[PDB]
Amino acid sequence: GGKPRGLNAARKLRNNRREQRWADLQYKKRALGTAYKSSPFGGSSHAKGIVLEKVGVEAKQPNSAIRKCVRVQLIKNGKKVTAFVPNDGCLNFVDENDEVLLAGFGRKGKAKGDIPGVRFKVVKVSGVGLLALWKEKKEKPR
Amino acid sequence: GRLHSKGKGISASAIPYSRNPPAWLKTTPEQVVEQICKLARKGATPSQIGVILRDSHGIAQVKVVTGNKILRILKSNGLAPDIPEDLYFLIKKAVAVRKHLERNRKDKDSKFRLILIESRIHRLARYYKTVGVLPPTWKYESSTASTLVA
Amino acid sequence: VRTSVLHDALNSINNAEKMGKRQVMIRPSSKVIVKFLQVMQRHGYIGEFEEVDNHRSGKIVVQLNGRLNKCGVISPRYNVRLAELEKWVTKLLPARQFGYVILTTSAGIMDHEEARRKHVAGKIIGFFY
RNA sequence: AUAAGGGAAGUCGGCAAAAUAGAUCCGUAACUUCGGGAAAAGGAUUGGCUCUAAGGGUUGGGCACGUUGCGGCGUGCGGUUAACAACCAACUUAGAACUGGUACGGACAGGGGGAAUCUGACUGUCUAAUUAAAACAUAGCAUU
RNA sequence: GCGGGUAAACGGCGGGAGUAACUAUGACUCUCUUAAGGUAGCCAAAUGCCUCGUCAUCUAAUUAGUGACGCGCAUGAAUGG
RNA sequence: GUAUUGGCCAGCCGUGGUGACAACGGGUAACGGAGGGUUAGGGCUCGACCCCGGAGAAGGAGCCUGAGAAACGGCUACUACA
RNA sequence: GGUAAUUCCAGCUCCAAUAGCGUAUAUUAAAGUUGUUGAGGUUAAAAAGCUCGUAGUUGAACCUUGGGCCUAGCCCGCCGGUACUGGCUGGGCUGGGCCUUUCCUUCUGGAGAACCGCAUGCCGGUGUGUCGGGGAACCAGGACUUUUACUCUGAACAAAUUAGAUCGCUUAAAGAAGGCCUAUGCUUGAAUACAUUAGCAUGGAAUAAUAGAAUAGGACGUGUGGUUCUAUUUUGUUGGUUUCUAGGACCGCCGUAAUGAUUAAUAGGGACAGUCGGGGGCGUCAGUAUUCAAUUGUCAGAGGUGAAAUUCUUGGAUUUAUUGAAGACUAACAACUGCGAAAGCAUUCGCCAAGGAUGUUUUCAUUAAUCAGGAACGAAAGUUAGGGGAUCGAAGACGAUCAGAUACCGUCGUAGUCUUAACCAUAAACUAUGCCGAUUAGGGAUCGGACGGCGUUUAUUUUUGACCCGUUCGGCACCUUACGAUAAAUCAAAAUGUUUGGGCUCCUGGGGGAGUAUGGUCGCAAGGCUGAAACUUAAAGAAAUUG
RNA sequence: AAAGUUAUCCAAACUCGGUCGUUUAGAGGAAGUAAAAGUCGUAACAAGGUCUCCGUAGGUGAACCUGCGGAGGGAUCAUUU
Ligand SMILES: [Mg+2]
Ligand SMILES: [Mg+2]
Ligand SMILES: [Mg+2]
Ligand SMILES: [Mg+2]
Ligand SMILES: [Mg+2]
Ligand SMILES: [Mg+2]
Ligand SMILES: [Mg+2]
Ligand SMILES: [Mg+2]
Ligand SMILES: [Mg+2]
Ligand SMILES: [Mg+2]
Ligand SMILES: [Mg+2]
Ligand SMILES: [Mg+2]
Ligand SMILES: [Mg+2]
Ligand SMILES: [Mg+2]
Ligand SMILES: [Mg+2]
Ligand SMILES: [Mg+2]
Ligand SMILES: [Mg+2]
Ligand SMILES: [Mg+2]
Ligand SMILES: [Mg+2]
Ligand SMILES: [Mg+2]
Ligand SMILES: [Mg+2]
Ligand SMILES: [Mg+2]
Ligand SMILES: [Mg+2]
Ligand SMILES: [Mg+2]
Ligand SMILES: [Mg+2]
Ligand SMILES: [Mg+2]
Ligand SMILES: [Mg+2]
Ligand SMILES: [Mg+2]
Ligand SMILES: [Mg+2]
Ligand SMILES: [Mg+2]
Ligand SMILES: [Mg+2]
Ligand SMILES: [Mg+2]
Ligand SMILES: [Mg+2]
Ligand SMILES: [Mg+2]
Ligand SMILES: [Mg+2]
Ligand SMILES: [Mg+2]
Ligand SMILES: [Mg+2]
Ligand SMILES: [Mg+2]
Ligand SMILES: [Mg+2]
Ligand SMILES: [Mg+2]
Ligand SMILES: [Mg+2]
Ligand SMILES: [Mg+2]
Ligand SMILES: [Mg+2]
Ligand SMILES: [Mg+2]
Ligand SMILES: [Mg+2]
Ligand SMILES: [Mg+2]
Ligand SMILES: [Mg+2]
Ligand SMILES: [Mg+2]
Ligand SMILES: [Mg+2]
Ligand SMILES: [Mg+2]
Ligand SMILES: [Mg+2]
Ligand SMILES: [Mg+2]
Ligand SMILES: [Mg+2]
Ligand SMILES: [Mg+2]
Ligand SMILES: [Mg+2]
Ligand SMILES: [Mg+2]
Ligand SMILES: [Mg+2]
Ligand SMILES: [Mg+2]
Ligand SMILES: [Mg+2]
Ligand SMILES: [Mg+2]
Ligand SMILES: [Mg+2]
Ligand SMILES: [Mg+2]
């Protein structure tokens, strides 16, 4: 309540709606385009990279485990990020300098589960596909 | 309520339903007008000419008695004041407050009153200017305005 | 200050009827108000009404007989073509069978159903059902 | 006084010398006690000859009668020349064409500049005959 | 002589031991000591012996210059910072 | 001067023009439109792409012929590649 | 998931869609979590400290209504009949003509009707015509007519697309095709509506704006004079001149006419009368108290605390009485009481200007409401220069307590606390509740003004003042109740809201980072105003219930 | 009527300086967030053992303490001649 209601006040309503519409966070991040600037992906869905080392990260307090993530250096723009490796026993397959392919967790830039500070997951290694290699549908080329 | 206040009073006067003179008035419109013109030349403004005639002798409503308005009579007889009486009194009051203020430098309350009075003068002058009683180039300049009143 | 004497009249009628009174008093009276009352009367929603004539503006005293649910006013007078007039009846009427929306047109102010019969449009001023 | 190429490699140290310099027009940073810094930094033009334009002063304005020997007057009474005519007079500023061994503040006269630190606020004063400074004084502040 | 006041009066304004799930340091604690134990600030500065202190910058190369660090032989508040 | 009007240009003379009803400037991962996606109604978002209009042929400028070109499967010059 | 795992690794069995199913990113619904329709602002995120005021938005009522006849079209019922006809003295509904004081502009030309008679011819009507009295309607041309917004109907506007009609491509997504006996043939379709902003015409005349007669500079007349310009054909032709006539502009005299001004808003401004208040400014008067000083009497303790000490004392402390000086402050009366825009305002009296409410058969006549930027005031503390400096007392120095005590307790004590001339502009600046306007329920108190009344009291006494009863206007508040509202506490507004629109301005969108960094702007400074992002998290938070 | 030539115009390209925009190295200084069985105290929630909070100013290892003026979101809706 308290809006202008006259028949010639369309400008005030349009200006107020445009100004107050910035308080939304999804729209504010859309207008400023942080994905184009700050996001590791240049507003894309996937990205290609080079594996540098394998690192283990401890789970949060209620849980207790080592999640066995991995370090990756991006080919597209050369910055270095950390990504997760899922399922079980997959760490053996991915060697050093293996040209991995990455994707998101679906949390849209936020940590998933008890895994701290990891926003990406490995989809392919040596261009074969992790899940297909896991089920022994293919053999990793040397 | 009011332009510069918080009061909500309703004190006023109620005009009777009848628009005809009482049967005991026995005064013609032709005779009555000369008392108005004599008093106007003696110096009384239209504001209290009506109240003095009303209290002293006879006429209660000049409009009902003569069919014409009181100010209109003076204007048609060439006795209308050059400036309206309400603006004249507002100017006089603003001058008197300014005169007190210059002696009393730190009366912040009278300074506040003066801002309201001048803003009311400007608002009323805008109406008179846009209706044509005063010339469009008339301006309220505070320095020599004291001569207009007297 | 007073910006809608029509709104004041309908609000006072609605309050008295909802609280169960039988008579209503309206301080300002106007031609649009009386023309609205005649429309209500022609459909039986009210009874006698009287306009006392003081020289200022006159007053209104309406006689109620129940049977009235609500009567409201739309304050911004929109412009409605004839083709979209059914949007409003879909919007602010409980059902199409009964209820009336009051319009103002070049042929006087009138309800939306015979106004449709007259094949005319104009501006919207209120409603009652 | 002048020197090819290099341009402080000399020396305690750019000591001495060189480079800039007038006027007209553009352009001008950090900082700041908002007064300055500022001629900041950094650019363009400059002769001779033949022309054009602008900037002033002085004297003149209609009828109608009466003295004085066409004139000075005395008057009475109208118009504002859609500003005209003649004469007189020095300098200061702007613009155009042509011209030359591309030169022209042609001699004289005539600021090198920038980024920072230490120290005294400034102008001023003193060891005449080896020391002119950070020394003294100063306005301001405080005490007896 | 005895008893008070006064520092924009002359001037002054400390040492030794332990101590934090590596190492280092010491927020913390005991102890001697008197008029008070250098506060706000500042620094190899015209004030630092060890000293050409250590790190960065400037150079092909710098005991010089500048910016930082501070248990400061022996900085410091109208002896003005 | 141009096919013609026009501060398009050359001379002389005035001091103007736009703006809080948002001028001027900065961003655009911006060719515009017909239109695509999603629905009670109102809307939100996309539109390089078969239809219409505009622009370009590595980056700038200049020009002949011809009714029609500042053309690049036409020419001249510079820069960068080759 | 820490030794019997319905959730991991496997085997059985089962579930969902199915030639398809999962994952990532983007976008819409879900989202009444962007809210014009339609969102919160007492306590959950959020009404600027307060007022004035410009752009901007919004603005009280009032001017031709009704009635009386006639008629056209369109539905419904009924009375029968046969798609279907008269009807019914039917009832509605749309529309078009006249009289009611109103009715409907005007001239020229076209063709020509209706009503009339003239004679000529048939079975009380007609061709009749080369008849005119006469033009219902219509057409073409000229002049006059307040102007916008709004709505109705037209015109003009792309193919594709969207909706949508037709035809069995074997159905369908598509396509614009096809169909008919047997044909050396015939026939059809390839529609239609919407767009919607701007521009062009037509009808309507409510709603919302605008113009007109007040120094008459007003309307009309074949009334009557002027002075200026223009000039069609008629007197053979040409040139010049004049009269009459026709038109335009302008100015007098006279006559004609009902000769021209809406109310006075429980809108607003102003005037007047008796009052009211701790509203503001300057000056002045008084009061005890605290501290200090002088005089006076006596003699051993006085202060302070839960308990002590630091401190002062026969150099007479503390205490008693009298006098003097200085600065600050106005007790009791003092309240569910008053005034001011808020911050705020309390001893007497004099002077100066200002204000609310009431009363009023005064005056003007829409002058109004809220406001982006902009402006005035703005507790306490703080800053810059003078005066003053009693009391308290940041900083500081001591005495106790305590394991420690840079504190809470006690004795001192600087800036400050007061005032004059200038800055600063923030507070839990709180009713945590914006401003204007309308309506809604019972009660009794109370402050100011006015009106009515029976009495008491009292005075150089009456009328006045004090007390009592009842009504009304305007305030600061209170008790009960819920038809109502909310999550609830609670509310006469926080009501009249899913049955959602009286007008205006501002602010908020999970919690942190953060009122931080940076830029700009004001200030002597302290600081004020404006105000992000990276990153991180599944909960923070409100009201109430049992412990 | 070709080469050549004089003076304007349209002007690519290069050099030097100024200005705006984006990215990025840096001794040292000073914050935030998370993970901890770390050290020192106990400020707040009960009258949290000195009622809590707001504006302003000063001080101390740290939470914090003290002065002035406010608020109840309090531990009081209340005391008579
Ligand atoms: Mg107001
Ligand atoms: Mg009122
Ligand atoms: Mg040489
Ligand atoms: Mg040489
Ligand atoms: Mg050189
Ligand atoms: Mg050498
Ligand atoms: Mg050398
Ligand atoms: Mg030299
Ligand atoms: Mg220079
Ligand atoms: Mg300089
Ligand atoms: Mg020359
Ligand atoms: Mg030179
Ligand atoms: Mg000096
Ligand atoms: Mg000497
Ligand atoms: Mg010398
Ligand atoms: Mg000296
Ligand atoms: Mg150790
Ligand atoms: Mg120190
Ligand atoms: Mg040192
Ligand atoms: Mg040195
Ligand atoms: Mg150094
Ligand atoms: Mg060195
Ligand atoms: Mg050197
Ligand atoms: Mg020393
Ligand atoms: Mg010293
Ligand atoms: Mg020293
Ligand atoms: Mg202008
Ligand atoms: Mg582009
Ligand atoms: Mg396109
Ligand atoms: Mg082209
Ligand atoms: Mg080309
Ligand atoms: Mg090609
Ligand atoms: Mg081509
Ligand atoms: Mg098991
Ligand atoms: Mg098991
Ligand atoms: Mg919400
Ligand atoms: Mg809260
Ligand atoms: Mg809150
Ligand atoms: Mg109205
Ligand atoms: Mg189809
Ligand atoms: Mg009134
Ligand atoms: Mg004694
Ligand atoms: Mg005193
Ligand atoms: Mg009182
Ligand atoms: Mg008192
Ligand atoms: Mg404002
Ligand atoms: Mg103050
Ligand atoms: Mg003070
Ligand atoms: Mg001084
Ligand atoms: Mg002072
Ligand atoms: Mg104390
Ligand atoms: Mg004390
Ligand atoms: Mg605030
Ligand atoms: Mg508030
Ligand atoms: Mg408020
Ligand atoms: Mg009485
Ligand atoms: Mg919670
Ligand atoms: Mg709670
Ligand atoms: Mg940096
Ligand atoms: Mg670092
Ligand atoms: Mg506490
Ligand atoms: Mg509580």
PDB file of C-alpha atoms in Angstrom, chain C residues 5-122:
ATOM      1  CA  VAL C   5     -18.164  11.816  -3.118  1.00  0.00           C
ATOM      2  CA  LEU C   6     -19.288   8.672  -4.921  1.00  0.00           C
ATOM      3  CA  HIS C   7     -16.824   6.625  -2.895  1.00  0.00           C
ATOM      4  CA  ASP C   8     -18.037   8.245   0.314  1.00  0.00           C
ATOM      5  CA  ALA C   9     -21.669   7.470  -0.529  1.00  0.00           C
ATOM      6  CA  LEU C  10     -21.104   3.833  -1.461  1.00  0.00           C
ATOM      7  CA  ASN C  11     -18.832   3.250   1.533  1.00  0.00           C
ATOM      8  CA  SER C  12     -21.461   4.621   3.920  1.00  0.00           C
ATOM      9  CA  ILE C  13     -24.170   2.494   2.290  1.00  0.00           C
ATOM     10  CA  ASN C  14     -22.000  -0.620   2.458  1.00  0.00           C
ATOM     11  CA  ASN C  15     -21.149  -0.065   6.120  1.00  0.00           C
ATOM     12  CA  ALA C  16     -24.740   0.490   7.185  1.00  0.00           C
ATOM     13  CA  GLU C  17     -26.036  -2.489   5.228  1.00  0.00           C
ATOM     14  CA  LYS C  18     -23.309  -4.800   6.520  1.00  0.00           C
ATOM     15  CA  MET C  19     -24.141  -3.708  10.064  1.00  0.00           C
ATOM     16  CA  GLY C  20     -27.885  -4.142   9.425  1.00  0.00           C
ATOM     17  CA  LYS C  21     -29.290  -0.604   9.362  1.00  0.00           C
ATOM     18  CA  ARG C  22     -32.394   0.480   7.459  1.00  0.00           C
ATOM     19  CA  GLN C  23     -31.626   4.140   6.688  1.00  0.00           C
ATOM     20  CA  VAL C  24     -28.497   5.923   5.475  1.00  0.00           C
ATOM     21  CA  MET C  25     -27.367   9.546   5.344  1.00  0.00           C
ATOM     22  CA  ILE C  26     -25.084  10.988   2.658  1.00  0.00           C
ATOM     23  CA  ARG C  27     -23.690  14.485   3.152  1.00  0.00           C
ATOM     24  CA  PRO C  28     -22.760  15.501  -0.422  1.00  0.00           C
ATOM     25  CA  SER C  29     -25.254  14.825  -3.199  1.00  0.00           C
ATOM     26  CA  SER C  30     -24.572  14.970  -6.923  1.00  0.00           C
ATOM     27  CA  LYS C  31     -26.150  14.194 -10.270  1.00  0.00           C
ATOM     28  CA  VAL C  32     -23.920  11.167 -10.840  1.00  0.00           C
ATOM     29  CA  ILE C  33     -24.893   9.846  -7.400  1.00  0.00           C
ATOM     30  CA  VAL C  34     -28.614  10.171  -8.066  1.00  0.00           C
ATOM     31  CA  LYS C  35     -28.229   8.586 -11.512  1.00  0.00           C
ATOM     32  CA  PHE C  36     -26.464   5.668  -9.790  1.00  0.00           C
ATOM     33  CA  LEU C  37     -29.234   5.323  -7.222  1.00  0.00           C
ATOM     34  CA  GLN C  38     -31.860   5.162  -9.957  1.00  0.00           C
ATOM     35  CA  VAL C  39     -30.000   2.214 -11.502  1.00  0.00           C
ATOM     36  CA  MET C  40     -30.030   0.467  -8.122  1.00  0.00           C
ATOM     37  CA  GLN C  41     -33.726   1.218  -7.689  1.00  0.00           C
ATOM     38  CA  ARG C  42     -34.680  -0.093 -11.115  1.00  0.00           C
ATOM     39  CA  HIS C  43     -33.284  -3.471 -10.054  1.00  0.00           C
ATOM     40  CA  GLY C  44     -34.879  -3.380  -6.621  1.00  0.00           C
ATOM     41  CA  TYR C  45     -31.738  -3.291  -4.495  1.00  0.00           C
ATOM     42  CA  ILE C  46     -32.913  -0.243  -2.502  1.00  0.00           C
ATOM     43  CA  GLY C  47     -36.117   1.561  -1.559  1.00  0.00           C
ATOM     44  CA  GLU C  48     -37.118   5.203  -1.306  1.00  0.00           C
ATOM     45  CA  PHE C  49     -34.451   7.878  -1.159  1.00  0.00           C
ATOM     46  CA  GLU C  50     -34.883  11.531  -0.292  1.00  0.00           C
ATOM     47  CA  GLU C  51     -32.797  14.594  -1.123  1.00  0.00           C
ATOM     48  CA  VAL C  52     -33.197  17.427   1.357  1.00  0.00           C
ATOM     49  CA  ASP C  53     -32.262  20.743  -0.238  1.00  0.00           C
ATOM     50  CA  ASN C  54     -30.181  23.110   1.778  1.00  0.00           C
ATOM     51  CA  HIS C  55     -28.572  25.782  -0.354  1.00  0.00           C
ATOM     52  CA  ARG C  56     -25.047  24.372  -0.003  1.00  0.00           C
ATOM     53  CA  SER C  57     -25.121  20.954  -1.697  1.00  0.00           C
ATOM     54  CA  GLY C  58     -28.135  18.961  -0.475  1.00  0.00           C
ATOM     55  CA  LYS C  59     -28.151  15.615   1.300  1.00  0.00           C
ATOM     56  CA  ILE C  60     -29.404  12.083   0.660  1.00  0.00           C
ATOM     57  CA  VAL C  61     -31.278   9.677   2.937  1.00  0.00           C
ATOM     58  CA  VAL C  62     -31.591   6.189   1.455  1.00  0.00           C
ATOM     59  CA  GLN C  63     -33.901   3.425   2.693  1.00  0.00           C
ATOM     60  CA  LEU C  64     -32.438  -0.089   2.791  1.00  0.00           C
ATOM     61  CA  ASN C  65     -34.292  -3.396   2.670  1.00  0.00           C
ATOM     62  CA  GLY C  66     -31.492  -5.915   2.954  1.00  0.00           C
ATOM     63  CA  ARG C  67     -31.014  -7.897  -0.258  1.00  0.00           C
ATOM     64  CA  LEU C  68     -27.759  -5.990  -0.981  1.00  0.00           C
ATOM     65  CA  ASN C  69     -24.366  -7.674  -0.716  1.00  0.00           C
ATOM     66  CA  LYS C  70     -21.734  -5.100  -1.684  1.00  0.00           C
ATOM     67  CA  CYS C  71     -21.342  -1.976  -3.820  1.00  0.00           C
ATOM     68  CA  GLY C  72     -17.894  -0.611  -4.640  1.00  0.00           C
ATOM     69  CA  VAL C  73     -16.210   1.960  -6.868  1.00  0.00           C
ATOM     70  CA  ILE C  74     -13.144   1.818  -9.115  1.00  0.00           C
ATOM     71  CA  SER C  75     -11.190   5.006  -8.465  1.00  0.00           C
ATOM     72  CA  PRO C  76      -8.987   5.245 -11.620  1.00  0.00           C
ATOM     73  CA  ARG C  77     -11.476   5.589 -14.465  1.00  0.00           C
ATOM     74  CA  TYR C  78      -9.989   3.201 -17.028  1.00  0.00           C
ATOM     75  CA  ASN C  79     -10.860   3.245 -20.728  1.00  0.00           C
ATOM     76  CA  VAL C  80     -12.494   0.012 -21.911  1.00  0.00           C
ATOM     77  CA  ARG C  81     -13.359  -0.933 -25.479  1.00  0.00           C
ATOM     78  CA  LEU C  82     -16.445  -3.004 -26.219  1.00  0.00           C
ATOM     79  CA  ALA C  83     -14.420  -6.133 -27.049  1.00  0.00           C
ATOM     80  CA  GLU C  84     -12.666  -6.562 -23.670  1.00  0.00           C
ATOM     81  CA  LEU C  85     -15.643  -5.666 -21.465  1.00  0.00           C
ATOM     82  CA  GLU C  86     -15.999  -9.362 -20.585  1.00  0.00           C
ATOM     83  CA  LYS C  87     -12.636  -9.319 -18.810  1.00  0.00           C
ATOM     84  CA  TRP C  88     -14.101  -7.122 -16.090  1.00  0.00           C
ATOM     85  CA  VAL C  89     -17.213  -9.259 -15.598  1.00  0.00           C
ATOM     86  CA  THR C  90     -14.877 -12.252 -15.371  1.00  0.00           C
ATOM     87  CA  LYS C  91     -12.769 -10.368 -12.826  1.00  0.00           C
ATOM     88  CA  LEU C  92     -15.019  -8.717 -10.261  1.00  0.00           C
ATOM     89  CA  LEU C  93     -18.411 -10.453 -10.362  1.00  0.00           C
ATOM     90  CA  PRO C  94     -19.159 -13.689  -8.462  1.00  0.00           C
ATOM     91  CA  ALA C  95     -21.094 -15.152 -11.397  1.00  0.00           C
ATOM     92  CA  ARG C  96     -22.395 -14.055 -14.769  1.00  0.00           C
ATOM     93  CA  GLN C  97     -26.053 -14.784 -13.991  1.00  0.00           C
ATOM     94  CA  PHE C  98     -26.446 -11.819 -11.620  1.00  0.00           C
ATOM     95  CA  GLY C  99     -24.507  -8.709 -10.702  1.00  0.00           C
ATOM     96  CA  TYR C 100     -23.995  -5.433 -12.522  1.00  0.00           C
ATOM     97  CA  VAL C 101     -21.066  -3.253 -13.582  1.00  0.00           C
ATOM     98  CA  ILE C 102     -21.844   0.442 -14.033  1.00  0.00           C
ATOM     99  CA  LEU C 103     -20.399   2.252 -17.056  1.00  0.00           C
ATOM    100  CA  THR C 104     -20.435   5.831 -18.317  1.00  0.00           C
ATOM    101  CA  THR C 105     -20.940   6.360 -22.049  1.00  0.00           C
ATOM    102  CA  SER C 106     -21.996   9.123 -24.417  1.00  0.00           C
ATOM    103  CA  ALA C 107     -25.593   7.893 -23.949  1.00  0.00           C
ATOM    104  CA  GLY C 108     -25.567   8.420 -20.177  1.00  0.00           C
ATOM    105  CA  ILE C 109     -24.354   6.104 -17.442  1.00  0.00           C
ATOM    106  CA  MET C 110     -25.748   2.591 -17.575  1.00  0.00           C
ATOM    107  CA  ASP C 111     -25.178  -1.034 -16.619  1.00  0.00           C
ATOM    108  CA  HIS C 112     -22.961  -3.373 -18.633  1.00  0.00           C
ATOM    109  CA  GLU C 113     -25.644  -5.714 -19.884  1.00  0.00           C
ATOM    110  CA  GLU C 114     -28.024  -3.357 -21.597  1.00  0.00           C
ATOM    111  CA  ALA C 115     -24.996  -1.226 -22.508  1.00  0.00           C
ATOM    112  CA  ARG C 116     -23.821  -4.308 -24.423  1.00  0.00           C
ATOM    113  CA  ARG C 117     -27.309  -4.513 -25.906  1.00  0.00           C
ATOM    114  CA  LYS C 118     -26.898  -0.882 -27.031  1.00  0.00           C
ATOM    115  CA  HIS C 119     -23.493  -1.866 -28.480  1.00  0.00           C
ATOM    116  CA  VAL C 120     -21.688   1.065 -26.834  1.00  0.00           C
ATOM    117  CA  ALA C 121     -18.600   1.442 -24.651  1.00  0.00           C
ATOM    118  CA  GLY C 122     -16.950   4.091 -22.503  1.00  0.00           C
TER     119      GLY C 122
END
